[PDB]
C-alpha cells in the first residue's frame, strides 16, 4: 500500500543547469535523492501493476517487477540522512542498485518479446517501454551524478563534463563499433568526422554513451550487409557535428542501402529487426526526446540513410 | 493457443432485420451460432488477457476469466451440427451457458470495484466494461433467439415480438420498480404514461428489460430521497413515448431534485454512486449505443431530471 501513497506525490525535476550550480552540498544532494527516488520508483511500479495481464504474468517481467519493489523497500527503509557517515552508507546502496539493475533493458526486451503478441493493443508496450526506459535513464543520471560529486575529476562537476568534446566522444564509440563489426565481418567502414570538430561545451556524456554506439552499430551493419561481395572496400560512414547556441546536432550518414519503404513504418517499434534485439532506434529516440532533443531518420532507398541526433545545450 | 487463432477470424454480425426473415431453419441457425459464438468469445478472452495486471489478478476477475475459457472449451468441443438430434443437444449447452453466466455483471462489478483504484489509467476499465457487457448482451440475444425459435409463441419470431407495445413493457417494469421502492420507503411515485400509448411495432424486448428497470429505480429513488418529510405524497414520474419511422423515444421525467453539477461528470462512470452498485447508467448507455440508439440526460438542479432513451426501429 506504500507504493500508492508515494506515487501520489508530485516529483521535483532537476534540470542539468541546476545540477551544474566542506561537503555540505553532498548532504543536500543525498537528501534530495532520498525524497525523489522513491517517488519516481513508485510511479514505475504503478506502471508494472497496469501492464496487460498476460505480460505482467511473464516470469522475466515478474522478476524485474520484484527487483523494483525490492529497490523501493531498500530506499524507503534507509533512515533520513543526518550526517556525512549516513550519506557515505547511502552511496553504497546507490552503487548496489546501479549494479543490480544494469541488465534491466535486456530483461524487459526478452520478457516482452513473445507476450507482446497476445494483447489487443500493442501500443501499450510502446508507452510502457518509453516511460520505463526514460525514467530509468533519469534515475541512473541522478544516482551516478550524486556518486561522482564525491570524485575530484578534472573538467567534471558530477557527471557533467564542463568541456565536452563531441568529436572525442564520437571517436571513442567509433573505435568500439569498428571492433565489434570487424569481429563479425572481417572489416568495418572508416568513419570521417567533419563540421565543428573543435567544439567544446558543458554537457552530460551518459545519454551519448547509449545513443552513439547504437546508431554506429546500425550504420556499420547496414554498410557491411549491402557490400557482401567487397567487404575489403566499403563506403565510409560520414559524421557531421553542427554546434550552435540552441542545440548540438550529430548527423550519421551511411551508404548501406537505406531503410526500405515496407520497413520504414516499423523500424521505430521495439522488437522490430531485419536480422536482433530491435531496441536501438526506439530507445535512442525516447532518450533524445526525454532530454529535449530528437532522433530523425532520412532514408534514401537504394543508397543509404542519414540519422540526425539533436540534443539541447545546458542553458 | 486456440484463443489467439479463433480471435483472428472476422465475425459475421446479425442484424435484427435478418433475424426477422420442417425445422431446416433451426439447423442453419444452430450452425451459425456454432461458428459465430467462439469467435466473439475469443475476442472477449483476449480482452481479459489485456486487462491491467492488478485487475486480472483479482480472484473474482480470475473466476469470470476461467468461466469464459471453460465456455470457449465446451463450445469448441461440440461437434458440427449435422442433424436435428445434434441441434437439440446444442440447445442444452446454450441453456446451461445462459444459466451459468447470469450473474457475470455482478461478479465484474465487484472484482473491479477496489482493484480499479490501483491502476494508472482508469479509462481502460470503461472501455473493457463497455466492450464486455455489450458483447455479452449480443451473445445472450443470439443464444436466447435460437432457443426461442423452438417455441410457438403468438406475436413472436424467436425473441422478436412482432407487435411490441412500449406502453405494456413500460407498465411491466413500473409495477416491478414501484414494489422495490415501496418495500424500502413505504411508498413509491405514481407513473403516468403519455404520448404514443397505442404504438405497436416489431421489436426485441430484451434490452428494454435491462434499461427500463434501471432508469425507473433511479427516478423513484431520487424522488423518495428528495421528499423524506412527505413520503405519502411525492411527485409523479412522467413517461412520454414518441414513436416515428426512424426511432422509438422514451423520456422518463422525474421531480427528484436533479443530478448536481459536481456529480454530473461522474454519473456515467461505472461504480459511481451517491448511495449502491453504480452500473445502471453506464450499462444502459452502452446497451443503447450498441443497438444504434442513445441515452441522454438533462439535469434541472433543484427540480428533477429528464432521461431520454432512443432505440432504432427494425428496418
Ligand atoms: N542505418 C541504417 N541503415 C539501414 N537500415 C537501418 C539502419 N538503422 C536501422 N536500420 C533498420 O532498422 C531496424 C531496427 O534497428 P534497431 O532498433 O537498431 O534494431 P536492431 O539493430 O536490433 O535490428 C534494423 O534491423 C534495420 O532493418
Ligand atoms: N433520475 C435521477 N435523478 C437524480 N440523480 C440520479 C438519477 N439517476 C441517476 N442519478 C445519479 O447518478 C448516480 C449513478 O446512477 P447509477 O449508475 O444508476 O447507479 P446507482 O443507482 O447504483 O447509484 C446515482 O447514484 C445518482 O447520484
Ligand atoms: C525505472 O525506474 C526504476 C525503478 F522503478 C526502480 F525500482 C529502480 C531503478 C534503478 C535503476 C535501474 O533500473 O537501472 S539503477 C538505480 C539506482 C538507484 F539509486 C535507485 C534506483 C535505481 C529504476 F530506474
Ligand atoms: C462476454 O462474452 C462472453 C464470453 F466471453 C463467454 F465466454 C461466454 C458468454 C456467454 C454468456 C454470458 O456471459 O452471460 S451467456 C452465453 C450463452 C452462450 F450460448 C454462449 C456464451 C455465453 C459471453 F457473453
Ligand atoms: K527496432
Ligand atoms: K454510475
Ligand atoms: Mg541496432
Ligand atoms: Mg441505478
From Swiss-Prot, chains A, B:
Q: Which reaction does it catalyse?
A: L-seryl-[3-methyl-2-oxobutanoate dehydrogenase] + ATP = O-phospho-L-seryl-[3-methyl-2-oxobutanoate dehydrogenase] + ADP + H(+); L-seryl-[protein] + ATP = O-phospho-L-seryl-[protein] + ADP + H(+)
Where expressed (tissues)? Ubiquitous.
| Location of the protein in the cell | Mitochondrion matrix
N6-acetyllysine PTM sites in chain numbering: 131, 172
Q: Which domain of life is it from?
A: Eukaryota
Task: Quote the record's binding site residues for Mg(2+).
Answer: 218
Keyword Transferase included in the entry's annotation? yes
What, per the annotation, is the impact of changing residue 113 to G? In BCKDKD; partial loss of kinase activity
Alphabetized, the UniProt keywords read: Acetylation, ATP-binding, Autism, Autism spectrum disorder, Disease variant, Epilepsy, Intellectual disability, Kinase, Mitochondrion, Nucleotide-binding, Phosphoprotein, Transferase, Transit peptide
Q: How is it modified after translation?
A: Autophosphorylated.
Q: What is its EC number?
A: 2.7.11.1, 2.7.11.4
Supply the enzyme class, top level. transferase
GO cellular component terms attached to this protein's record: mitochondrial matrix; mitochondrion; oxoglutarate dehydrogenase complex
Residues binding K(+): 267, 269, 272, 278
Describe activity control: Allosterically inhibited by certain thiazoles and thiophenes: thiazoles increase interaction with DBT/BCKDH-E2, whereas thiophenes reduce this interaction. Inhibited by 3,6- dichlorobenzo[b]thiophene-2-carboxylic acid (BT2). The ATP binding is mediated by both potassium and magnesium ions.
Provide any one GO MF term from the record.
Answer: pyruvate dehydrogenase (acetyl-transferring) kinase activity
Identify the metabolic or biological route this protein is part of.
Protein modification
Q: Where in this chain does the record put each Histidine kinase domain? A: 98-315
Which residues are noted in the entry as ATP-binding?
218, 254, 273-274, 278, 281
Q: What does this protein do?
A: Serine/threonine-protein kinase component of macronutrients metabolism. Forms a functional kinase and phosphatase pair with PPM1K, serving as a metabolic regulatory node that coordinates branched-chain amino acids (BCAAs) with glucose and lipid metabolism via two distinct phosphoprotein targets: mitochondrial BCKDHA subunit of the branched-chain alpha-ketoacid dehydrogenase (BCKDH) complex and cytosolic ACLY, a lipogenic enzyme of Krebs cycle.
Describe the disease involvement stated in the record for this chain: Branched-chain ketoacid dehydrogenase kinase deficiency: A metabolic disorder characterized by autism, epilepsy, intellectual disability, and reduced branched-chain amino acids.
Subunit and partners:
Homodimer. Homotetramer. Dimerizes through interaction of two opposing nucleotide-binding domains. Interacts with E2 component of the branched-chain alpha-ketoacid dehydrogenase (BCKDH) complex. Competes with BCKDK for binding to the E2 component; this interaction is modulated by branched-chain alpha-keto acids. At steady state, BCKDH holoenzyme contains BCKDK and BCKDHA is phosphorylated. In response to high levels of branched-chain alpha-keto acids, the inhibitory BCKDK is replaced by activating PPM1K leading to BCKDHA dephosphorylation and BCAA degradation.
Into which family does the record put it? Belongs to the PDK/BCKDK protein kinase family.
Protein name in the entry: Branched-chain alpha-ketoacid dehydrogenase kinase
Query: What lineage does the source organism belong to?
Result: Eukaryota, Metazoa, Chordata, Craniata, Vertebrata
